[model samples]
Target: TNPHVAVLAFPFSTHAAPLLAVVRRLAAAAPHAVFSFFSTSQSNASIFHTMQCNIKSYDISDGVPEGYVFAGRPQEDIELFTRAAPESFRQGMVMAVAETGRPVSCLVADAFIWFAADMAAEMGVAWLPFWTAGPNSLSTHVYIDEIREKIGVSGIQGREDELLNFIPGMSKVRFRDLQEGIVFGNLNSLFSRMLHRMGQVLPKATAVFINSFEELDDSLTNDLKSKLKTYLNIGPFNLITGCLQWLKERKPTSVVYISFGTVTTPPPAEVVALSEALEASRVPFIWSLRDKARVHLPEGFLEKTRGYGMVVPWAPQAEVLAHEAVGAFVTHCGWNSLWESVAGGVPLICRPFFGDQRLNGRMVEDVLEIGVRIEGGVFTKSGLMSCFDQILSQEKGKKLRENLRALRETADRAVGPKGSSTENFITLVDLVSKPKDV
Candidate 1:
């Protein structure tokens, strides 16, 4: 019998491309497995231009699985599942499954969607939780409930200087290390509500798949496995986009690659400062400027630095980091970017924007000692000379870069064929493909 799977996704641009790539790869590997990718009406409209497969868009009025009720307002619905009309979502799933004339074998839901586990249980189908973030961030989320219990929810809200030291394999974290959702209590509140419900649901899912490789966070991954029997890490998957094709032409470890992930917008002043610094350093570089409107470079800045820099809106990040030319990464410490930098064997100059980014920045700079944080704090420019001197003239930068390079071999081995991730991914495929005992 042919196996059919369903994927539920939210409407964020960054997630849309990557999520589609995963689904496509899964479909290719399991040709017998037909996948029904579900997106909100708004996300479907936004992604239609780039999507290669025919997709189904459902309205958000759907309610949750049985035994669950919609709890938040329209705007308050940050988690895609929470905002969804639970009943509609359930109905859509039932209708889609019935139309296929085949029982839905499995449900692969984003990590943020806590209800997927329950829905799968109700339907007696396999459930897989696919996390879009790194293991470090997921581990952080897993422990957030405990942290909040020890320290009241009000403890670290709105303040940027509060220190967090409870996370394992890391030293200390700042309030800034928390994601904006947690800091503002918006995303975290919703997650908190779901976590309560998930306490009984998570164990029912077949497995959890994180968008990370084993080498990136062995400690955290092991910790997760202690609780969840099946935790799979198959990632640095974003590299599949081919963003780093330019790295071959440059000298090994000679170029600095800069990217701010997808959501961040560097102020005009900071952009100018970074441009000047790159120019002043005389280092070859590639920078991905996500929001051109906010990144105001000075007149002639690109022209003056023409020989040393290339600025584009987006590049295949994994490819760029894997390139020999990329010696250092100036990043916002988004978990995916952080893992890519590590996988590529490149050091970092972290300037975290929000959420787990701050925590990740601390992990790179303080815990691993494999990267440095950009000074001058958020919304302030640390100047071009300072950046130049830190990356170009400082011995610590050189040492960090060397360490980063050393880790590349380890990262490669972990993701290679027969590696932990590879095996886990295979197991996941098999689990979802198995015949249910009717």
Candidate 2:
């Protein structure tokens, strides 16, 4: 066989999630390539269950602060994470690999966790970057300074309100639409730090594996490949499955699925507005929202819409979208949400919050034309109704639905055995499986 490989992810939903899927996929595809998944005691407690795979799991301190809340608290989380992670990550890797008595030949690490790169180097292990978001998002951060010079406006200082036209392969990017960390935040802005760290780290990867199929970000993915030693897109991944049965019960194209992903929330005021609009639209909707965010919901709004809308803390988003009943999605336009929508042929009603989300929403509306956005990127009763009418209208929604199906089929084919994503995955497996000292 070959040297054992370790697949590790950061604890956040956007980073930690799909890599676990990648490891599982690999263990399934290449049984000879042993894998070890690594996490932290803090995050481990949150894992709902153990993975079902020949691949192993190792835990160490994630360096998340006591009672640390990850969402909407970038500065606090980043400060602790960057300071506490490197040593903890390095030590955990050393100890776990030592116990197995198998040298770690390759390490697939989250691109955001640049600290892992230095540790992998210090240990003389091959480090492959596993990017969880869109490649377009990565380069926006990678080329932040250049974008500012070419398209940034003055006074407004690159706020989302200012329109930007110059990024390669992107369309209709407002200054604020640029990934949150790239625009006019402070020098110590969390995004600024992540961008700075990525600049230092990405060049070191021998190749990169991303969670975007070529069908979605072909141009940007190609451009990225030219800059890196290797690039592969095997994505739109999901860690959990079996939600299709839940959807089989609903009527076709009659249900609306709403998810804002895990990290950001719509303002409570906006939630109130959305509740009223859902009532007005007279549509059946499944809202996947955090229990904490319920505070933002209007008092008695649940009772008012009880028969029409169902709210859950989380939903099997990909499966829900794949359901014939799910004709549309009201999403935060997070890249993961974007991918899932495209995968399941569910049209988008975009309410992008921040970071890559704004950029992603722009991509959805301008390039793909499969969804419409809430105007001015703010939610209002009127905006919600309009998007609702547009995405759910039999005549209009059908047009978007057909397009989404086209895109979904393309996405589907990419991950199939003969698909481009599968080819990319096989290439990655071969690279990692190659004997060391190659």
Candidate 3:
């Protein structure tokens, strides 16, 4: 019996990296399962799309006009691609099902790709919703309706210290700390659109998959498992790129790795401040800003800093973190970035920009005590300098390292052969191995 599975991530590295990793794992675990890792034709940046395909992969059109690039602006990007997604997804899945000569057992799609859920319903296929973030963030999406009813939109605008008790695992999360979607009321905006999209398709899913580990967030994981029809902890997927070979050349705890993820757009002023601070701090650092956001590079910043720092368009963060020479991380607090940092046992200097990233920063700083959050979410020369001093401090750094090491150990156990995630992943493989009609 062939279990044909269609797996997809919404054409972004942050979303695709982990989901695609899960796809790879599923392929390895159940080679019999027919796996189709779908992406947009224009975006070859994904690990799955670009990687030598051991399994079948597809990149359908997102239907943007010719000469268009995803500007990385959520608002325009959402409006543009959402329209293109439905027809393309339907056609892709339909064509995939046809070619396999077997019915689809299930559809596993990114949490934001609500279209797949709708298409699943039309074709009578089971759908597994994949959230590429933490359970805390996914929980908010899982119960957006109730959040709107109980807290109201205005409640989202509450004070900085305001606590939102709606989401079960994050009873103490501040309103200001809530990701942008939960705390803002911008119609059709990227944050609101994504939240609203999840509200529609998540409940209809046959199961939910989180790119997280049970040991990392057991309380939230439990809460989510109880609520969803089916729940799986299949991650902190631990995917890494080849740049890891570069890290072997450096000594341990001698370098700081900085990256703001693929989506964040820090202001030019902020970039300048970071450039100046990195220069003044005189620490060996690697700054991985996205190519789209590189326009704000401070004049002669690279020339001035020269050998002291490396400013790359992107870096293999997980490998960098695992390297002996790397001492700490300055990250956007994106879940993937956070997971990589945690996996590498590196301390964080959290600079969260928007969405769940904000709450992620808080979790790392206040809850886990493994990182320091930049106050007011602003990066300044003084703030950056002070944060590095604190992070590089021998005593405090030891504590963070110990905590990170402990978490990483637990995570390793969970994703281990006998671990929770391994079983969940296998369970998912079986779940999608057979069509519902069977």
Candidate 4:
């Protein structure tokens, strides 16, 4: 029988593309293994249209098996789907398996959807959790609860540059650098609940895969490995397209690349501030603006800075960052963006939005010294300009560029041959092919 693996995906618009890219890469790498990439019918349609691969879409609304529904919410759905619509996801999985007419050898579940591990376990298949975030961020998430307990949450709200000392790879994080999720004291908050759920499901998986390379977070990677037996770091995965072509034409460390990842959006004031800063700095830049809701920048801002800057609704970030001209990144500190910047050997101007992004910025700025945080009163034009100027002009910018280049080289080596991540991938395949009886 042909070995088959199913990837359970969430329908998030921003994340779906990268996740699909991973599945496609894996399928291309292991042609002998039959891989079934599972997304909701809605999400599958989008994936099918965007990708050339034959994807099997499933409806997740079917009734879950008995004893699997906890208070009408399927255990699998709650764990894997965040209880958004468990029945729909459960039905999709069932239909995919039934159509394949073969028992799944393994399940590759997104970190956000932990329920897939339970389903895989029940069906006697190995389950691997694929985190779309960086190892440093994962470590932060895993230990945030303990950190909160220790710090008691005073500095996070009102304090300026309030220091948090507990994060593993980071020396000390500022209060403002922490996300609103971490600052909120209530246990019922979204971040708290998600963290609780993640904590519950992470240990059940056969292994964990973080979307980062060891070179970017060697210290944190070593610490995490001590805790979790199987952890794979394979990422900077979004650079495999036209973006690379664009990057090749530019001079080394010359262009500033700006992106807010998939979901982050700078308010119109901040946007204009960034625009003016870019203009003032006279730096060549490629900025990807993703906010459809807001007016974005002040009118004619692009036209005014046309020679020095190029602004698009969206651009292939990985490709842009990898470009030789791309010297620095102005980012919202999304994990994918952060890792990609590291992989590309570019320093950053960290302007984080929400969630762990604030912590991520601190990790990059204070701990690693790979980036500079834009700090001021609130997320405003002045703050953005200050950050842009500080990072673009400072003497430390050259040092940061050097540090990032060294890290990128290290990343390339670690993912190449005999790397910890490569070995882990091989082991994962073996475990999936031969599951031990419980």
Candidate 5:
């Protein structure tokens, strides 16, 4: 009998993309494994077309109950969905088993969906939770208890600048350096409670998967291995294609690629500043800015830079990153973009916005030394041009490229035959396929 693996998605922005990447890989590796991916209808509509024959998708409630009047407020919508997710996921599990004629041997979910641990326990199935963020972020979650003991929940209020060196795999991390959710906002909120509870229940998971490579974070990744039942670093999950023709004509490592991400756009003022900086720098560049944001561009900026700049609403990012013409990246430092830049061996010029972006940018600039962050975390014309000069025409830029190239080699090796990621993936397939308590 084929192994049936139930995968539950959080269905929020950027969350489902990497989860799908992992699922796609697992589905390919184990042709006999039946993968039932569950998400809200809104998310499923976008990703279901990409699934393989053995991988089927089922819809779960968006947490909007029948007859619930939608006011369209952001916070209310998310809270409603979170409150309703448990019951909806349970129904999805039943539907999967009934339709597939197989019991779910394992349950895979976003690491934030802590309820999966309880569900897996009740079903007596393996629970493998995937952390889509970097290992550095995961270290904070793994040591949340220690953090609470060392620095009380309210202790961070006055000590935002205080260094927190107690956490494993994290060094020189200040209290303020942690995600806004962990250190800035209301600690008793629904999402906040879920994060804290997730850390408390992490030990109950059969195995934990992180989106990273061992070589990328040797100290932290290995430390996690010592603490968890099984910790898998199968990462750098960014992939893509397109716009190759333009890149083909450029000189090697001569172009800069800029994109905030699908879900983010800079404010109009920042957009105008960046546009002017790019124009003045006279650097060959490509920017993926949506039309909604394009109106903020300075008049004549596009036409003036027509010789060297190209602006498109959306870019085949992975493809653009991988191109040899791309020498540096200007990014918001999302986990996906970080890995994509790493995969491309391009150095970064980061201006992080919020959430995990700040922490991710910190690691990119300070820990990894593969990029530089914008001074004070905002864009300025001089700052943009300074980063451009640093990454494109300076000695520091060369070193950054060297370090990134080495890291890229390791990343590539991590996913290749007999690599750590590859071996762990095989183990995952076997663990799910083999009958337990036989």
Candidate 6:
């Protein structure tokens, strides 16, 4: 009998998309394997269609009671859904098994759903959890306890620049490099608690899947492999589209592509500062500004830059990043954007907002030498102009472009035929194709 694989999704931020991509790849590779994907109805709805007959999706409650009004707080929504995850996911797994008459042979879940380890143990199946971010950011989470003990929660606040040499496979990582929850933010917050829990349970999985290539961070990848049962670097998914007609007219490496991702909207003042900077620089650009965030634009700012800039509520980000005319990226350094930028071979002007973004920017600027961060970690007219100049200038920008070229070649090679990612993915297909004894 073919093995059954149960997948659990966290359904927040950009988490669901990459996990779904892995499932698609697995389903195509292992045609006989049966897969049951479980997520909230809203998430399932967006990624519902699949050509693979062997895979099916199941929607669980989002944990918000019917007609509940959210108080404009995103964390509240996430917490409620998470609080109910254990039971909801377990029930979905049971239902899938009963319907198909084959017990689940493996479980592939988002790493944040820490309860998955226990759930897989109970079902006597192999558990392979997926981390949707790069290994550099993951090291902080994997070693959260060590960091906390060394700094003490109170000590971390003012020691942001203090280097953390204690963590394995990571060097020059400062307290400031970690997410707010891990450093000076509320330790008892839901996010902080979740991070602690995930760190604790992640080591117990049969294997861990990271959405980045081993070439991207060999030290951390090797370290994680020694700690976990197996660590697979099977990605750097280079997914993309358009506003292509506009890009076709621009000269090579001339446009600065700006996007803060779907969930991030820079403060109105920062938006105005960036607007002023773009207009002042006269650099051709594409700004993927969200509709709601449009109000933050300076009055008539869009009209003023219309000739030299393009503003769309949403642009096919991956496509725009890969465009030849796009010289620099002004980004918030979200994991997807960071990886996509690397895959696209473009240098960055980073303005990280939260979570793992700052760490991502650190890798881009400090580690990889592929980008520069905005001065003071926020947008200002002078800072934006300076970064633009640095990213566009032939001397400094030439070094950045050379560094990016090597990294981008490695990224492409990892996904190429017989590449590291290709081999790792084949290994994953085999791991999930056979039943396990826990």
TM-score for each predicted model, relative to the true structure: 0.79, 0.90, 0.90, 0.81, 0.93, 0.95
lDDT of 3 at 2: 69
lDDT of 6 by residue, 1-438 (tens): 578999999888888878888888888888888899999889998877436788889998788888888888658988889888898898888899899898888999999888888888888888899998878777888888887788887756567888877776568677788887775777888878988888877888788888888887777778888878888888777631148998999999899999988678889999999999999999899998988888888898888888989989989888888889999999888888987787677898988888888888888889899999888988999999998898886687889989988988888888888889888988888898886563
Task: Decide which is better by TM-score, 3 or 6.
Answer: 6
The lDDT values for all models are: 0.67, 0.74, 0.76, 0.67, 0.83, 0.85
Whose lDDT is higher: candidate 3's or candidate 4's?
A: 3
Lowest summed-lDDT stretch of 10 residues in model 5? 234-243
Candidate 1 local lDDT, residue 162? 67
TM-score of 2: 0.90
The 10-residue segment of model 2 with minimum total lDDT is: 238-247
Best-to-worst lDDT order: 6, 5, 3, 2, 1, 4
Give residue 19's error in model 6 in angstroms. Answer: 0.6
Clashing pairs in 3: 3-433, 251-324, 251-325, 252-324, 252-325
Residue-level lDDT tens digits of model 4 in 1-438: 556677777666356666777777666556566667766566667666753343454545323355563565323333444554455555656666687676567788777765676677677877787877667556655666676686666544456465655566655766565544454545565446776667556766678886566766667777777666577776556433244655566666778888887667777767767776777667777888764733667777767787666777779776677666777898888877877788677888887767677777777876678898666524555666666555556678877877777766666666667865566556655654553344
lDDT of 1 by residue, 1-438 (tens): 467687776545356555666776676667666677676666656655443343344444423356666666633445544656355457667767777776777888776667777777787887887777666666656665665565566656556676655666433666556654443465446655664445445545678887667766666777778657688877667433333555667777778888888667677777877876777667888888864453377888778877767888878777788777777888888777776787777888888765567777777887778887666664334444565466656787688877776665666666677777677767777866665447
Q: For candidate 6, give the lDDT of residue 230.
A: 85
Per-residue CA lDDT of model 5 for 14-71, tens digit only, reads 8886888888888887788888998999898876644578888889988887798878
Candidate 3, residue 198: the lDDT equals 79
- Model 2: per-residue lDDT, tens digit, 1-438? 366787666876666667777777777777776677777655555652655456777786656668865677656655666567777666766775687777777878888777667766866778888877777777776676677567543435435465555555665566666664454556466547766677556867877788878877666776777667788887656412234555667678878888888787888888888888888887788899899898888788789778767888988777788677887898888887787777677889888866678777877887788898888778888888887777766577888878877887777788776988878888988877764553
Ranking 2 against 3 by TM-score, winner: 3
Model 3, span 292-344: residue lDDT tens = 66678877887988777787887866678777788889888888778888877
Q: In model 1, state the lDDT of residue 110.
A: 73
Those runs of model 4 whose alpha carbons end farther than 4 Å from true positions after fitting are 28-32, 45-81, 152-170, 174-186, 236-254, 291-294, 377-394, 435-438
Model 6 TM-score? 0.95
